[PDB]
Design a protein around this ligand. Structure first.
Ligand code: FAD
Ligand code: FAD
Ligand code: COA
Ligand code: COA
Lengths: 444, 444
């Protein structure tokens, strides 16, 4: 009956909505550190590029609707600093006044996501050095672009956010450099597939520096350069995108179990090891359908799914989380980059015996106008032929293929079974055998 | 060792290639009535529209390649007129010289497809009255368009071909009318989804006539009008697209079993009831994954799969055909029209208890530029919640959704399990919950 939720975004409010819809007696208090509930972080790079009019467009439901329409007691500017799991009390600080409030719970959900990491580099705090996570973050980047002469941009790190932001700055007419981390090589794409990414970057004049270590950001009051172990380069704006950390520091002393990076362990039902405490989203671990271990792959689709499940389970509407597949998709310049399941680094790290098939193909009938190349790779088990993962790169029809591969991994299909599926074909959409099925046929 | 195949297209040559690849000693004779092997009938409307340079582009493999590279004794202009299943002899008549040849078989495959039906209308034979099946057919339509002054085009019938051809003639700048058969209402799309098709046709000034019966085609040497039971309309070119008949006429007298429309019955292994006689493609029946009965849904994806399977089984590499889902996709003007599994007419005819969910949604994040409307309908069993079928209509991202639905149907998934699949999401491709999942959530 008293439900407390910490975090006011995808996971926390997916949970809140379930409770509110399915328990009319429920007293729901939500605790959010900032001033903005339920917004699409994913739209941030597209507001910065100007493709979306403003950050207000990213708001999915405001705090006024949560309060007035749904009877949720949604707090803004409340940062939780401590949880007492024996007394069942949450302590929150008002972020302006610093006055302390306490909230009694019957069931608690931790839905506090992750934060971007800023390594301990000289110059970290120079004006124009940025992280990107929140609407205020995006506004500070725009403010730097508005109030300065920005021509050279350096991105530290790659991955989804780094690549999307490279595109965003290219589209804003900047000269973009990105300095990539070698600990992140092979983590998303195999090396033979990442080649298409390097080619596309190079084609659009995005300089990618490999095997080079940042050491300081240089400047007086603002950044003007980035220093690495191999040079110093002019930069008028630096975006740091090198990793994330679960926002779980405040739970120190609660006995709530955490993996090595600080993500909260959850069982099938979003429950922690501590009675009546739950977790969901980027702050929690994510059972992996193919690894069969609790991984950490923080994304918004998983966050919404786990938050919804956590709400249902907190109402005792028992329902197991089926897992994540590690699915990810990125728009990068002219290319779409998609992957799901295990890549080679992951399969090797698990000691799962696998083979691969790679096909350079087209997204549709080769004779049809504007058929575009499509590169597709599948991993499958050597013994049982179970499909393990796929990576797809090209300009069109990539999302279709990764979604089909995601479906196959979800159903634990053997690679050769993909040959039997009655997928759609007409000349404007596909070939009579889909690229996935042609790759399946080449498998042993 | 002596394999005889009748039909030199998708099913027949898919079989041929398997036999040739997997039996070094095999003597393969293929018998094709026309002069063209292995071509994409699907590309024909797109050659006619000018989108594809010529019919030559549609040829996948030459008879010269089959003969020289693969050692297949590929005959052209050989029309099989009878089969003696006791003596195991195939009788073919040369289409020009009328000479008769005998071919002895150890295993026989019938891969003779369907033919478009021309009802017995006065004027059937007027110049400018056309069927569309073969490359010569497309050439004759082009000849009519090149010579004759064509302004008004009438299409009799609908379905994929009628719709694709209405677009083709619009793009060639003609005034297009379609006269639709009421025996085919609800057979492909439910009435509520067909509405989008009528709106789209009307939008582009394609006049569609309903509950109106053709009576005659009028003209001198060439066609110039179409008469129905309600009027007579100018037409300089008529395309008739009212149904297909399996090309199995010639088998009368054998004991080879056929369904009511003449399609040859095949078991799991593409075998007829007659020892050592197989069938595949449009001339055969198609086991339906969801109906659990042998249907007839002639389409090129199925023909290639069945032909390949027939070749394999003819070599005793035993492999069962898993079935068809009745998947179909059409480009029509600005819309993509897709369906798979059962629609309401099919579910009702089978007495399967079902419910439906319909969602008016978008293909991607609503705040992202050029997000387009997406209309999606699912049917599911009211008892077990098994997904039964789906129809998807919209401008972009329709093929992706139907392929995901096809995968779900293939795996016999419950509608609510769709909520748990880790499908891809980024703002340019989808919403955080795919439309399929939002519809799934609305189901009982
Ligand atoms: C630039 C960018 C692009 C992205 N693109 C995609 C994409 O294309 N596809 C995709 O699926 N995902 C994408 N994501 C990720 C997706 O946005 C997140 O996974 C999702 O927001 C996670 O939801 P969550 O509720 O777990 O955490 P969050 O959305 O981070 O919400 C956590 C909330 O908790 C609050 N909080 C933290 N600590 C406390 C505390 N002590 N007290 C009170 N409140 C606290 C924070 O203020 C925050 O609002 C992207 C993210 C970024 C930054
Ligand atoms: C305009 C059009 C558009 C299409 N679009 C699509 C689409 O978008 N997607 C899709 O999946 N499918 C599409 N199809 C259907 C697809 O083309 C067919 O399903 C596929 O060609 C069927 O292959 P099949 O080998 O069984 O029959 P066919 O390809 O018809 O081949 C049978 C062959 O047998 C020969 N033959 C017949 N009788 C005899 C005889 N007695 N003796 C000797 N030879 C004989 C014929 O000459 C023919 O070449 C389309 C068809 C048309 C006409
Ligand atoms: C906005 C947010 C609170 C969603 O709240 P929600 O109420 O769960 O979602 P909706 O408002 O779409 O409502 C969904 C429910 O209403 C039901 N519903 C919606 N329309 C319906 C209709 N017309 N008829 C019947 N039922 C309907 C749905 O079936 C669904 O039911 P369920 O929850 O029992 O499965 C949550 O997603 C959020 O905070 N998001 C943050 C933004 C975000 O997603 N960020 C990550 C993006 S990277
Ligand atoms: C063209 C046609 C003969 C295909 O013949 P095919 O030889 O089976 O097809 P391909 O040439 O693509 O060869 C496929 C085989 O080679 C193998 N192969 C292809 N490239 C390979 C490679 N690079 N490395 C290893 N193996 C490869 C495939 O795995 C496949 O093997 P399998 O048959 O054992 O599964 C047949 O589809 C046809 O006649 N089509 C008519 C046109 C049509 O499709 N019409 C209907 C469209 S509507």
């Amino acid at each position: 009956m008293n439900y407390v939720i910490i975090g006011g975004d995808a996971a926390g409010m997916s949970a809140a909505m379930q409770i509110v819809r399915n328990d009319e007696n429920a007293n729901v208090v939500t605790l959010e550190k900032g001033e903005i509930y339920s917004y699409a972080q994913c739209g941030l790079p597209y507001v910065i590029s100007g493709a979306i009019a403003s950050t207000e467009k990213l708001i999915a439901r405001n705090v006024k609707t949560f309060r007035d329409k749904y009877g949720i007691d949604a707090k803004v500017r409340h940062e939780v600093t401590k949880v007492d799991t024996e007394k069942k009390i949450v302590y929150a600080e008002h972020t302006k006044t610093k006055d302390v409030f306490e909230f009694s719970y019957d069931r608690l959900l931790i839905a506090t996501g992750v934060r971007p990491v800023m390594p301990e580099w000289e110059g970290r705090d120079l004006q124009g050095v940025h992280l990107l996570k929140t609407i205020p973050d995006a506004e500070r980047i725009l403010k730097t672009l508005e109030t300065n002469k920005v021509e050279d941009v350096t991105i530290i790190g790659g991955g989804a956010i780094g690549l999307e932001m490279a595109e965003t700055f290219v589209e804003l007419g900047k000269k973009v450099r990105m300095i990539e981390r070698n600990d992140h090589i092979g983590t998303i794409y195999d090396g033979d597939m990442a080649e298409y990414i390097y080619k596309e970057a190079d084609k659009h004049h995005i300089e990618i520096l490999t095997n080079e270590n940042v050491k300081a950001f240089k400047g007086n009051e603002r950044v003007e350069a980035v220093e690495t172990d191999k040079g110093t380069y002019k930069a008028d704006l630096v975006l740091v995108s090198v990793g994330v950390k679960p926002n779980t520091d405040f739970l120190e002393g609660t006995n709530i179990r955490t993996n090595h990076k600080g993500a909260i362990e959850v069982n099938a039902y979003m429950q922690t090891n501590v009675q009546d405490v739950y977790a969901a989203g980027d702050c929690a671990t994510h059972y992996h359908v193919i690894k069969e271990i609790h991984d950490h792959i923080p994304i918004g689709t998983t966050a919404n799914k786990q938050g919804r499940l956590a709400g249902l389970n907190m109402l005792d509407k028992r329902r197991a989380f089926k897992g994540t597949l590690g699915t990810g998709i990125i728009k990068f310049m002219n290319l779409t980059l998609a992957r799901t399941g295990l890549n080679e680094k992951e399969a090797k790290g698990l000691h799962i015996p696998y083979k691969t098939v790679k096909v350079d193909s087209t997204n549709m009938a080769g004779y049809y106008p504007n058929a575009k190349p499509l590169y597709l790779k599948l991993l499958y088990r050597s013994d049982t032929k179970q499909l393990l993962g796929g990576q797809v790169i090209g300009e069109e029809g990539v999302d279709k293929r990764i979604d089909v591969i995601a479906m196959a991994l979800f159903n634990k299909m053997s690679i050769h079974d993909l040959e039997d599926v009655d997928l759609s074909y007409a000349p404007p959409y596909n070939s009579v055998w889909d690229p996935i099925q042609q790759a399946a046929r080449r498998a042993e």
